[PDB]
Every structure is written in C-alpha cells, then in structure tokens.
Amino acid sequence: AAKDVKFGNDAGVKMLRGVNVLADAVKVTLGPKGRNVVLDKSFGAPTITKDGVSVAREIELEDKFENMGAQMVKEVASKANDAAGDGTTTATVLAQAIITEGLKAVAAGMNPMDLKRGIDKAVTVAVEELKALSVPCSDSKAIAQVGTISANSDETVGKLIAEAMDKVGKEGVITVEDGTGLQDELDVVEGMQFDRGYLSPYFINKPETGAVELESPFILLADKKISNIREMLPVLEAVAKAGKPLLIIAEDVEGEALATLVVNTMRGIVKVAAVKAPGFGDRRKAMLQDIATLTGGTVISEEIGMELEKATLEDLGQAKRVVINKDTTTIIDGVGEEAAIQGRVAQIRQQIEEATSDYDREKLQERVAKLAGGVAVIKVGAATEVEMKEKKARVEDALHATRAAVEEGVVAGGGVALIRVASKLADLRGQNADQNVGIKVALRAMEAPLRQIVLNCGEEPSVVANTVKGGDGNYGYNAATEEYGNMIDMGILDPTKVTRSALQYAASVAGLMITTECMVTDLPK
Amino acid sequence: AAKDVKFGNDAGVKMLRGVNVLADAVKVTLGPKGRNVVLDKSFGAPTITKDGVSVAREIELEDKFENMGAQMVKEVASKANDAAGDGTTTATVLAQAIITEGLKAVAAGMNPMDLKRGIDKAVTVAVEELKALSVPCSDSKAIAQVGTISANSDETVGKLIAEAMDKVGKEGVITVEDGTGLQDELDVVEGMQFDRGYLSPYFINKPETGAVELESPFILLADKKISNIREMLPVLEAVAKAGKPLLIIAEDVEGEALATLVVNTMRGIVKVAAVKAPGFGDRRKAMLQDIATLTGGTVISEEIGMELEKATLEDLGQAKRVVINKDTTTIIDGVGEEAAIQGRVAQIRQQIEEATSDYDREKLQERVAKLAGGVAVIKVGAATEVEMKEKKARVEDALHATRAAVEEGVVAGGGVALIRVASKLADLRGQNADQNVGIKVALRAMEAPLRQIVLNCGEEPSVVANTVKGGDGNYGYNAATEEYGNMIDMGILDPTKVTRSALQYAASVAGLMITTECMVTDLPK
Amino acid sequence: AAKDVKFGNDAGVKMLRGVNVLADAVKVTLGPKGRNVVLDKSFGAPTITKDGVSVAREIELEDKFENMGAQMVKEVASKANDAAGDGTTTATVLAQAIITEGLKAVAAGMNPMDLKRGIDKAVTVAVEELKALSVPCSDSKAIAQVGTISANSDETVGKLIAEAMDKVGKEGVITVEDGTGLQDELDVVEGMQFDRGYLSPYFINKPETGAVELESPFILLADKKISNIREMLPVLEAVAKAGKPLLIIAEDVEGEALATLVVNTMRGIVKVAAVKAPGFGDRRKAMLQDIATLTGGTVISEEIGMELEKATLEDLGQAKRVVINKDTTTIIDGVGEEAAIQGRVAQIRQQIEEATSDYDREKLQERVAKLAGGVAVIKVGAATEVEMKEKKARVEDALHATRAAVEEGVVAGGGVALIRVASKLADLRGQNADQNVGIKVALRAMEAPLRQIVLNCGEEPSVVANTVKGGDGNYGYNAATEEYGNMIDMGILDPTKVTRSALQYAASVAGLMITTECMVTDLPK
Amino acid sequence: AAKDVKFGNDAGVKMLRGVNVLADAVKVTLGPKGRNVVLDKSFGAPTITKDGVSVAREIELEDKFENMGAQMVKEVASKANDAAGDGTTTATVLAQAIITEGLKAVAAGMNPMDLKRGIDKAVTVAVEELKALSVPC
Numbered sequence A, B, C: 001a002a003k004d005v006k007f008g009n010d011a012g013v014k015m016l017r018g019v020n021v022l023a024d025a026v027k028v029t030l031g032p033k034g035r036n037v038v039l040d041k042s043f044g045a046p047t048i049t050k051d052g053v054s055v056a057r058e059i060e061l062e063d064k065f066e067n068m069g070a071q072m073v074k075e076v077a078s079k080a081n082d083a084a085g086d087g088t089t090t091a092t093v094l095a096q097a098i099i100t101e102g103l104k105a106v107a108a109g110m111n112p113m114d115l116k117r118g119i120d121k122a123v124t125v126a127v128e129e130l131k132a133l134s135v136p137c138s139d140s141k142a143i144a145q146v147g148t149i150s151a152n153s154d155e156t157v158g159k160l161i162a163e164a165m166d167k168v169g170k171e172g173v174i175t176v177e178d179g180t181g182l183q184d185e186l187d188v189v190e191g192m193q194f195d196r197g198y199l200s201p202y203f204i205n206k207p208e209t210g211a212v213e214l215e216s217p218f219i220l221l222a223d224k225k226i227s228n229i230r231e232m233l234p235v236l237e238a239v240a241k242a243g244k245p246l247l248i249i250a251e252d253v254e255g256e257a258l259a260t261l262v263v264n265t266m267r268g269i270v271k272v273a274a275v276k277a278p279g280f281g282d283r284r285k286a287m288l289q290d291i292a293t294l295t296g297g298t299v300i301s302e303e304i305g306m307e308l309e310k311a312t313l314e315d316l317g318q319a320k321r322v323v324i325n326k327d328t329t330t331i332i333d334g335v336g337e338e339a340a341i342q343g344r345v346a347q348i349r350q351q352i353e354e355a356t357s358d359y360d361r362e363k364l365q366e367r368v369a370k371l372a373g374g375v376a377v378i379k380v381g382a383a384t385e386v387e388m389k390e391k392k393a394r395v396e397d398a399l400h401a402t403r404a405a406v407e408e409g410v411v412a413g414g415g416v417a418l419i420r421v422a423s424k425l426a427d428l429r430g431q432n433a434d435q436n437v438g439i440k441v442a443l444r445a446m447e448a449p450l451r452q453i454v455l456n457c458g459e460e461p462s463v464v465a466n467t468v469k470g471g472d473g474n475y476g477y478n479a480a481t482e483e484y485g486n487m488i489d490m491g492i493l494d495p496t497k498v499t500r501s502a503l504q505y506a507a508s509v510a511g512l513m514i515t516t517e518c519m520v521t522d523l524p525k
Numbered sequence D: 001a002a003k004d005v006k007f008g009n010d011a012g013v014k015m016l017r018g019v020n021v022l023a024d025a026v027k028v029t030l031g032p033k034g035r036n037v038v039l040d041k042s043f044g045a046p047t048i049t050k051d052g053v054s055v056a057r058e059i060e061l062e063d064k065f066e067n068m069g070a071q072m073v074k075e076v077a078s079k080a081n082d083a084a085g086d087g088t089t090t091a092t093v094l095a096q097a098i099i100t101e102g103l104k105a106v107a108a109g110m111n112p113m114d115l116k117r118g119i120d121k122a123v124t125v126a127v128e129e130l131k132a133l134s135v136p137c
C-alpha cells in the first residue's frame, strides 16, 4: 500500500513522542513505591497493576510513526525479560534516558554514529565495572540469604532453594509443584532439560508463566522434519484415546503440520505441543536418543526405514510432567527404567574416555550431566489451597532470582550500582567530542533508575541522587523506609545479571534509534 | 478505467519527486557508515535495516505519478541485483544523480534525445575504462584474498572458497550447506545446474534468497508441455505419500496446470515447483535425458506413447537437494548410479568425436562438463547451531562476491573507481552541445557514490571528493577509519562486475525517464 | 439509465478535448525520434513504450463525452491497424489535424455536410495522386531491398523473403517458424490459406501476434452450423486422447457451442479453436472439400445423413501446424496424400475447361491456386534461443512490410509523400466555399505527419516543412540524421498501402465527428 | 510596515511573470502590422493605441513581486525613450528575450554573475559592430 516516509528531525520527534508515552506509562510502576496503572478490559473491571511488562503490552499509539517508536523501545523490555526475566521497567527508563538526550544531541548537530560509539564504549566499560563490583553468591548460605530476601524475608523459601541446589547443583534443574498439603517436599526424579522452546505460542496453556504444561503426556521422538499431517494422523488418534496429551520432539515441525496442531489443540481436539530436537547435526540424533532412554520411547528415524504412520502408543515415550518456555523444554520424571538410563550413562561415560577432542569431550559430559543429573522437584507446603498457591508463587520468584544471583552475583539495588559505576567512569573519553557527548549521555542515563524510584516515592530525585552520589560503596536510599543506609545490610540487592541486561538492551535499542534516518509506514488510510 | 494523463514538465516534476523519495530513503544506508531505516510491520516490532533492497521493496507512493517514478527507478536496483547480486544502493544513487541533472537540462530546453545519447556515450566509454583499470582474480591466492575480505577478514572462509574452486574450477558449481558440527567439509557430489528458474514466484520458500529449496525431492521429467492438471493428479498423489516434495522439469507448465500448482503448494498441499527444461528443439530432449541419467529418473515423452497418468514413483528421478533461482536450477547429489552416469558421459564423449560441426561440438562438450563436473558442496563448521548458521551466511556472501571477482576482476571500492574513470573522460565530447551536457551529467553522477558514503559518515562530500580527485590511482577515502590511503592496500574492493552493472542499469533507466514525454495512470478514484 | 444529452457546440468541444488527449499521448511516439510514454500497471514496473497502439489501448477518460471522442478516433488506429498493420500513429495525427480544423470551421458557422464533402473529395483525389507517385516493388531485387530495410538493414532477412516469394510467388502464402538451430531453412509444403479468422478471441494463445497457433492438430470439417455441444462431445473426447489440439472448420459455431469451447479451452481442458468455412453457398461445400483433400479428412455433412456423434479420429483431417488471425486461417503442411491432392487439382482443372462463365472460371482458378500453390515456410536461424526468437520477430515484420510493398508499391517516407500530394492539389475546388474550406482542411492535415516527426526531433516543424515543400520529388528530411536528401536513396520508404489507409481512415472518422450533432451518454452516476 | 521577502527561484518566477505580462501587452504593437491595445478610462470611450509607451504606462500588477518585475523592465522603455525618443517597444521585447533565457539558465544552475558578464560582453561588441554597419547621415 502507499507509504508515508519521514526523514531526520521529522522522524525523530515522532519516535521520541512514542517512546515517551510508553516509557512514562511504564516507569510509574518502578520500585517499592511504584504507582498503579489501570488497563481497560473489554469486559468487567479494569486491570490494576504495578507490573511494567503488563503495562508495556497494552501500549499501541494512533500516530503510525509514534507507534513505531513505542514498539521499538518495547523491544528493550521484552529482550531484557527473555534474558533475565526481571528489570524490564529499569531497562525501559534507561532506554528513555539515553534516547532523549541522544536525540537532543542529534538535533544539536552532533554526529549520530559518534554518539552511538560513545554510548557503546561507556556501556562496555560500565559492564566490566559492574562485574568488578559484583559480590558472588556461591555457597549455600549466600544462596539461602538471597532466596530469603527474594521471598519477602521468608527464610523457609531460602532454605528450600538452598537444599534444592545442594541436591542437583546450582546449575541443575529445579521445579516447583503444588504440595500434597502442609509441609514442603524435595525429591530428585529422573528428568532432563534442553534448550528448545515451543514451536509457537498458543501451545501456552498457562499465560501466567507464558509457558506450556502437560501432565503424564506421551512423547513422540521423530528424527526428521514433519510437514504433512497425514503422518501424524495414525499416532494422534492413538493418543486421542487413553486421554493423554502429546509432546512432539522432532527435528522440526513446519507450517502445514504445525498450523494444524495449533488449530486442533486450539479446539480442545487433543492436547499437543511441538518443540525442536536439541542440538544439530550428528549430536542431535545421539541426544534425541538420550530423551528416548529417559522417557522409555523409541526414536522414529527414516534412516532405519521407520514411518510415523506405523507408530503405536508403545513407541511413544512418557513422563509425569513436561514444561516448555519460549526457549526451554523440561521433562520431569520420565518412565524410562533406571536400568536403561544408567546403562546409557555408562556408554556415554566411555565415550568420554575414547574422546580424542576436548570439544567432543565437553559435549559428551554435557549429556551425561543431563541424563545423570535428574530434576529436583520442590512441592510447596500448604494449609489451605489459597495459601499453598501463594507460597508456590513466592518460591517460584525467589528461585528465579537466586538462580540469576548464582550466575553473576549481586550488586546494590535501588539503582545505586549503576550510579556507582557512572561515577567511576567520569574520566572516560572517546575519539572526539561527539563520542564524549555520547559517553556523558550514557553516564547520565545511569542515574535515571534511582531518580525514578525516588520520584515514585514522592521525594526529590535531585536531592536524593546528590546525597547518594555524595557517599560511596553500598551507601544508598531505601525507598521503602525513606532512609539512607547500606543497601546490602538493608537487604536491597539486584542480580548483577538483570542490571547488566537492562543496561545493554537499553543501549542497544537506543543506539539504533539514534542512528535512524528514515521511517516508512502505511499511509493512515 | 478513466485515466489521468500528464505531459512534459508536469510529468517530469512528478517523476523526479517520486525517484527522490525512493533514492533518499535508500541512499542513507550506503557504505560502512550507512544509517538505519525503520520499516513498519503490521504486527510486532518494526524492521530496522541498513540494506537498500529491503528499503526499496517497501517504497510505494500515494500520488500515482510520483509512484510511477519510484517504481521505474526501483527497476534499477532489482536488475542490478539480479545481474550482480550487490550494489543496488549504489545503482540507485547513480540513477538519482543522472535523472536529477538530466531532467534539469530538459527543463532548460535541451534536447532529451541528445542528452540521453551523451549519457550513453559516457557510460559506454566508462565501462571500457573500468575494464582497463580492473585487476584480475585468477589464481587461488587472489581468490583466497577476495574471499577472506568478503568474509570480514575470515581467512578460513577464504581458504574454503579457494579449495572449492580448485576442485570444480572457478567456473564450476559450488553450494554451501549446514555442517554436521564443528570443522568444515568439502566434497564433490553428482550434480548439475542449468539456466532455468522457477516458472513463477510463490514457489520461493526462502525469500531470504528469493529462491526455492527442496530436500530429497522427486523429479518428474516430462518431455512435453503440461496444461491439464488431470495428467498430474495420479503422480502428484503418489508423491503425496512418501512425504517428499516434487520438482517438475517439463517442456513448460502452462496457466491451468501452473495455476493449480501455485495454489496447492500455497496451502501446504504437497510441495511442488516447476521449471522449464534446458535448451530447446532437439538438444532439449537429449539434455532432459542427461538429467534423468543423473537423478535416476525416466523421461515421459509422448513420442514413445507415454502418459503422465501411467507414471509411478519409480519413473521419477531423485536428488538430495535442489535449488532454483529466478533463472537457474541446480540439482545437488542425484540418485543416478555412477554406472549409468559415467556411461552416459562416454556416449556424449564419442558424440564429440563424430562431431562434424563446431557448434554441435561445443553443445556436446557443455553437456559432458555438466554431467561429469558435479557440484562442490561446502559444509560450514559449527560449535553451536547459532554460530554455524552465521558462518554459513558469511561463506555464502563471500562465495558470491568471489565468484563475481573471478568473472571481471576488482577495482578500488568506496566509489573511487568511478571517480578515477570520470576524470579520465574529461575530454570526452559528443556530436553537439546538448550531447556534451549529457556527457557531463553522467561524469558528475559518477561522483555520487563516494559523496554519499562520505555524507553518511558525517563528513564533507566536496572536501573529500576534492581530495580524492586530487590524488590518483587507488588513492581513496576509507570511510570506516576516516583516513585517506590506498584502497587496495586497505582491502576496500568492489567486483568490477557490480560497479559496471550499477552504472549501466542506472543510465539505462535514467535515459528512459529523460526521454519520457507522457504518463498515463488510473484516476485517483 | 438516465442519460446526459449534449448538442452542437457543447458536444463539439467535448469531442475535441477527448481526441486531443488521445492524439497528444499517441503522437509523441511518431518517427525515429519518437518519445517514450509510460503506462502504469497494477503490479510491478510501469510499461515504457514508443508504440502508438499500446498507448491508445490505455486511453480512457473520466468525462463521458470526452471519452466518447477519444474512443471514436481510437477506431481510426484500430481500423488502419487491421487493414495495413502499420501507420496507426500517422493515422491518428492526420485525424486530429482534420477534426481540429474541421470543428473550428463548424464553430465558425460553416456547413458540416459541405466540409465533409470537401474533405472527402480531397482524399479521393489524394489517393489517386498517391497511386501515381507509387513506385513498384515487383522484381526480387526490389523485394530484397524492401525486406532488408524493413529488417533493420539485415540483408539476410531480405534474401529470405525474396527467396520465399520466388518459391510460392509474391502473392503466395508464407510463414515463419522457429528454426532447428543456426542457419535458416526454406521449404514449400502442402498448405493453404483462406479468409476466415477465429470465431472469437481467447482462442488466441499467442497475444504477441494476437493470433492462434496449433501444432499437429486434428481438423474437423463439418458442413453445417454447430449450436449444441452434444454433437461435439463424442469427437472432442476422441481428440482428448492422442493429446492433440482440434481445429473446427464448420459452416459456423454459434453461441451455445462456441461459448463452451471458449470456456473449456480456457481451462486447459482440450485445446480447440473454431473458424467459419471459406466462401458461402455452393462454392462453400466444394471448398470445404478442398480442405479435406489437403488435410486428409472427411467432410461431415447432414446432406449425406452424417452425424458428428458418429465421427472418429479417422474422419478428422490433420496438419503439422495451423495459424489463425483476426480474419485469416492458414493450414501448414497437411497430411493429405499428393495422390488425392494432385488428383483433386486435375478435377478442378477440368472444371475450368467446362467453365461457361468468367465468374465460375475465376472462382475455380482460385481453388487450384490455393490447393496447388502450397505454403513456403521460413525457419529462422538461431545460435541461442533468445537471438532466434528475436530474428524471428524481425523476419515476421520485414515480411509483413514487404508484402504490403508488393501490393501497392512504396512512396517517400517521413511524411513527404502526403506533402507532395497536397501540393499537387493546390487548385482542387468543390461546389461551394464551405467545400473549398473542407478541401484545404484536408490538404493542411496532410502536412501533420512530417511536422510531428520533426517536432519529436526537437526541430522546428514550420522551417523543415517549408524547406521540404520548397524542393520536390523524393526530397525530404531524414529525422534520424537530421539532414535533407533523397528519401528513396536514404532508404526511408513507406508502403503506399499504409499511407493510403492512414489517410482514408483518418478522413472517414473525422467526417463522422464533423457531422455529429448530438451525443448521448449515461449520467455520471 | 511588515514586509514579504522572497529569495532565489521564488523571487525569479515572480519577476519573470511580471515582465511577461508587461512585455506581452507591449510587443503586440510592434511594427507596421502592430495590433491595437485597448486601455480603459474612468470616463468615456477607452483608448485604442498601437503605441508601446502608452501601453507600458498603464501596466501595474496585483501581486507585489510580479509588479516589481514589471516596473523594473518598465525602466528599460522609459530610459530608451528619454535617450532616443523611440524604440521603447523594441527595447521591451529585447529585455524580455534576455530575461527569459537568462533566468532559465540561472534555474539550470549556471552562475548569474557569469551570465551577466557574457551578456555584457556580447552587447559591448555588438555596439561596436553596429557602428561599423552604420551609414552616416
């Protein structure tokens, strides 16, 4: 269709207006004193939230160009979300701060490419500096502390997570399920988790977690691509009976077949979800087999002249439960017999012996760890279904936060970590004045999170920022009590991973907008 | 429908406005310092690109006359793209420069026909001069260098391409496929490539390459035209099973039958693609047979009273993979047995002996080369599916660039080649003044690429242009480092072929617009 | 529907405006220095052409009355096209010139009927004078020259045409087909051509020539009208097999049956084309038989109690190829055996002996000539399918032009012929002053072609016209070199037939418009 | 009072339009076959003339910029009139011819100062040549 095309300044003011509407709606929810945002629904009472992602998802603007700016920066939150699962609001205020001052510098005549280079250099050094200030979370005591703090001071949740990580290792798989009633339960079952998410949304039966969950499902392990539904018809019907859901783990499920699965499972006509097989090439087949040995299934490969049509419920694997995210599939408690599984382990164990290459050695050790590691399951205590469902949510969050903490450590929260990093880069310089302006744009933006947290408290941003900058180390502002103090001692911590991600994604998208010269969109008609 | 009709100047300003919108949106993406263009999408985040072709595809204007001018010059990019697979942005800025000054001259009262003639003469001489300045790329060391440079200094990709061309010759067929995992692979398989593209788009399943790709498909070799789908019904269904795609290599697939194929394969209902048989007349049948021998299929000609209805999956040929462009079909690794194939080679080999005419001799040698040459296959290394998919892209581009370099050599990049050529034509004259103006219009336009690259850097076009013209040889401006130097020593090269094509297509379309007196389009109703 | 009705002047200005938009869009393409016209398409790049007929086809106007004027004069081009196959643009500029001055005279109060009479008288005398100046093209040398000139100076095409006409006579049938590859081929086969075109478009499988072409088809020779498809069902299916197209040569194919044929052959469902049988009355049957004897078929007449239902593929005639225009059917190389054919010739040969009437004698001689003359076939050389298809086009045109040249000779091109004729009629007078004005309007219009050619060159019409008129004979202006000289010596010739047709049709349509008093069209609603 | 200010091309088209109205009205009266121009009067019958000066005096345009162009070229005729007392119409058609093509060249991107310099050189030499051709009286 005919297009509307805008260049330079005209495009720039539009983009800025768009990010401002999105960022302003989102940032009011930041921190302990975050304000509520009311989101209208077509039916019933409006949604009232303090969750940044919930607000961002609703934002769409009428002006086509302004809307592009909002959708672009919306990418910041989503990516930060996918990478760290927290700090999407922080990332959005950082992006708005960099974009605002960056576009001003552009309008002033400064070189966009140089501004971006300066911003990027500052971020590169800032991340290194962030790592230097990071405090490790390696021993179980630390893990327990972070867990407790993330569970609203519930030492119970802290001990649970610490024990779970002591079982399967801090790098191991850990899940949480409803409890049998009163008292928590922690047991390790035969399970595995690989990096492959659902082949499309819709499969998502629990939008609360934006994931797909199946109970006691059958697992089809096809070593090939599936384009024609015909091949599935025989097995899908065999699964239609026994009233159990089906998990498709094939090399890939293309359009035709996938489209059908999305439509049928959409009408309650058999619950089926598909995900790509882990790895690629040779190791792929070997890994597809590990899943079979674990779930007690049979790989259906064309290499041995096998057909999906000639596949019965006996070939299918099975597990008590499977969960899949946007990019992760976890099989909990497989039917496979410890004899077959443990044997498979022994095999791969020798593979490592005969390993003539570190790479092949690494890849093999990865499989044994997955197949021999299992999956720790945390069954949340109870005393009434309501409280149980609640504690479960806390455990889930605490667990998520502790996991991130374990990966990259923790830093002072309340935005002070970024403020401390900014002060350490006061002498950073680039190749020219425009690059230096870019550097300053970024260091200035690093104060935005703390400032917005203070603003939401109803206090003066410049005053608090000035005071915090006046001190050093973990000295910061506790927005809940409105008192200054040591952020670590007051238990206000952020996983270094979410702070780093919020900053990198904000800068990444800001850099793109700052160097955008033209925008194309459909004519408002 | 009622038409709007415009003449002379009225039409001219409309066209100019149209090419300016397109050229201006596209040209900001030129060179190492190209800026981003944001393209709106109906769903999700907008597309942010620095790729000229991506931008051009989106351009369509509201005013019908302005739109015509944009679509006309859009043909420049597309043709240059089809011919050299690069330099579409350069071609567009050259076209804008010629059109702008040429239309100005027309408005000044100069003769359009003479202007065009002068422009054409300049381009004709410029192309000859471009060839003179071209540096060959014949030995494997040169091929390796070009390949390395085109692969972002990846000496690995350079060696690969060099070795691949050393196997099948620099004029041989080369393909790249995903690797089995870590470490690259180079092996020659039984394959062939003929000059025939898809009988219509849509078949294109990979718009990234604007090509059609089929894996382990069946190949129907019908020696006749196919108009009625009825004939196909039996075979299409046989192919429906076995779950394999079908490649139709007939004399031609006309409307009725073709239309159906486009619709069915559009609905996932059996994946089928059709292309015309290579050559024409007698040799056609002989060649169609070479394909059969290679894929292990059976030609279904009416001459022997054979019907497509009475054709089973046993008659169909087969290969591990086939790729088809806008005008090229390549069959990779055919089922045919070396016995039959090598035997077929021997036959044609004697044919050359009994050859009583050079023409027939040439044609026969062409077949043997194709049937005996094979197809070099490059399997990209790995170490994680992500990196593997990435390196594969680099190898693809590097290969494409190197291939072009091998055909016509290389010249200084950054727009200096065209600038050196222009200076060498300062004394070029035509049959009259208007023709001389035409010549100058062209010579002036030849500076546009370098000027736009500099402009995108944020530097001063005239100053850099002036300085570069001041020197000579490969002296140029490195836009990445913003330093002057020897373009070749700095590794900034352009295949002579893409520079030549960009210039010729730009002049071609510009000459047509310059000599346009009337425009007809639908009334805006 | 309610109508809008206009009279006199009101209608006249509308008509004039309409012919002016059409004529102005078309005339810019006249001559060697013709300008391009861009025609918008719904998809892809617009069409850029210098072809008058392509431009005219697109012209439709919004104002209903203006549109009528455009569609009316559009009939000039089409009729001149159908009659001579060239000079449609020349015809259109002559028409605009006559209409413009004619309508001015009407507005000035002159009698429309007298104006028309005067224009008609001038044209009548002009055509006679044109025949007087016409130079013959009888000998093979002349034929070769005209052919060479018409083939863009390709002396090869010139020899071919000359040889082809030397074989079957300059009045004989000649066709051109794709070559076998390199080197031209000329062979006389058993063929025939009669004056009957397709019974409707659509059958046209090659819009490039706007004709229908069938290869090795079956020929149904039904001596009666065909209204019900039922009769055909049996034979159509018999032809469904053997995979061969069918040519229906019946007394006529009416609605019901014809409509079906158009729809089925439209869906690839059997390729069939229908044309009326040559002649009428008695001779018709006798001729329909000549076709049978030639194609080896059997006439299915109801006179002998024969039914189309009881007709097998054995009754149908057959030939290697048949081509049918808007009003011509040519059967190339029929299956008929020289025994039957030559015998048939002997029969008709005696018929001429027993002829008691010149008319019957003439009609009989016509049949023997057609049945005994055959068809010279020209197979264009090759060396790549592309060049072959191109040269074929040139030979086609060169042949078409030479044919016309042979019929009425040639005259000086560049519009000097009409200029010479006009000057010879300077004393022509009519019955009254108004008729004299009509005469002058026509003589004046005769200068229009030369003037427009010069105008498209960018030169001054009045200066060149004045100079050409100053000389005499073949003295004219060479628009390609912009030099005066002898048009004949410079090889700038026009078939007298196209010049005569352009003038007569232009005057014809102009006379109708000049004598139109009222216009009726639908209300713009 | 507040002013309207125009630059380059915008100004050029306005001027050209203004001189064209004046020149076109004036030049129809040139030579033995000059045509009549009717000039309205507030009272009585209009003035019918073939005299260029009479026509030029009446020309004033509504658009302020176009009017400036007319008044400027009007200076040509008056000065030629004061200097030689004849040829004001000839001076006006020469002015329009130079202005028209000169402005076209400017719009084509040619240097205004150089165009003027060239025109000046041609006139300087043309005047010398005119003296050579001149027959004494």
Ligand SMILES: Nc1ncnc2c1ncn2[C@@H]1O[C@H](COP(=O)(O)OP(=O)(O)OP(O)(O)=S)[C@@H](O)[C@H]1O
Residues within 6 Å of the ligand: A029, A030, A031, A032, A034, A050, A051, A052, A053, A085, A086, A087, A088, A089, A090, A091, A412, A413, A414, A415, A449, A453, A477, A478, A479, A480, A481, A492, A493, A494
């Ligand atoms: N008492 C406190 N004083 C100051 N800052 C605090 C306090 N408690 C938490 N925070 C900080 O508030 C920020 C987190 O606020 P949230 O509202 O959860 O936003 P976000 O994590 O950036 O984005 P969401 O949660 O994905 S929307 C972190 O910087 C915390 O350190």
Ligand SMILES: Nc1ncnc2c1ncn2[C@@H]1O[C@H](COP(=O)(O)OP(=O)(O)OP(O)(O)=S)[C@@H](O)[C@H]1O
Residues within 6 Å of the ligand: B029, B030, B031, B032, B034, B050, B051, B052, B053, B085, B086, B087, B088, B089, B090, B091, B412, B413, B414, B415, B449, B453, B477, B478, B479, B480, B481, B492, B493, B494
């Ligand atoms: N460091 C450099 N300095 C100067 N010019 C460079 C440099 N690197 C690449 N170039 C030139 O930039 C041009 C290629 O830029 P691109 O943006 O890829 O446009 P294009 O190839 O003309 O069109 P696309 O790629 O089809 S959009 C060529 O003229 C290169 O020689």
Ligand SMILES: Nc1ncnc2c1ncn2[C@@H]1O[C@H](COP(=O)(O)OP(=O)(O)OP(O)(O)=S)[C@@H](O)[C@H]1O
Residues within 6 Å of the ligand: C029, C030, C031, C032, C034, C051, C052, C053, C085, C086, C087, C088, C089, C090, C091, C412, C413, C414, C415, C449, C453, C477, C478, C479, C480, C481, C492, C493, C494
């Ligand atoms: N060198 C030449 N000098 C002058 N007239 C020429 C020359 N070459 C061709 N012509 C004339 O150009 C006319 C033919 O021009 P075309 O553009 O083909 O138009 P047309 O044949 O009148 O109509 P079309 O072709 O059906 S659109 C004839 O009058 C030719 O004699």
Ligand SMILES: [K+]
Residues within 6 Å of the ligand: A029, A030, A031, A034, A050, A051, A052, A089
């Ligand atoms: K919040």
Ligand SMILES: [K+]
Residues within 6 Å of the ligand: B029, B030, B031, B034, B050, B051, B052, B089
């Ligand atoms: K680019």
Ligand SMILES: [K+]
Residues within 6 Å of the ligand: C029, C030, C031, C034, C050, C051, C052, C089
């Ligand atoms: K033409």
Ligand SMILES: [K+]
Residues within 6 Å of the ligand: D029, D030, D031, D034, D050, D051, D052, D089
């Ligand atoms: K006068």
Ligand SMILES: [Mg+2]
Residues within 6 Å of the ligand: A086, A087, A088
């Ligand atoms: Mg949070």
Ligand SMILES: [Mg+2]
Residues within 6 Å of the ligand: B086, B087
């Ligand atoms: Mg490029």
Ligand SMILES: [Mg+2]
Residues within 6 Å of the ligand: C086, C087
């Ligand atoms: Mg013609």
Ligand SMILES: [Mg+2]
Residues within 6 Å of the ligand: D086, D087
């Ligand atoms: Mg005087």
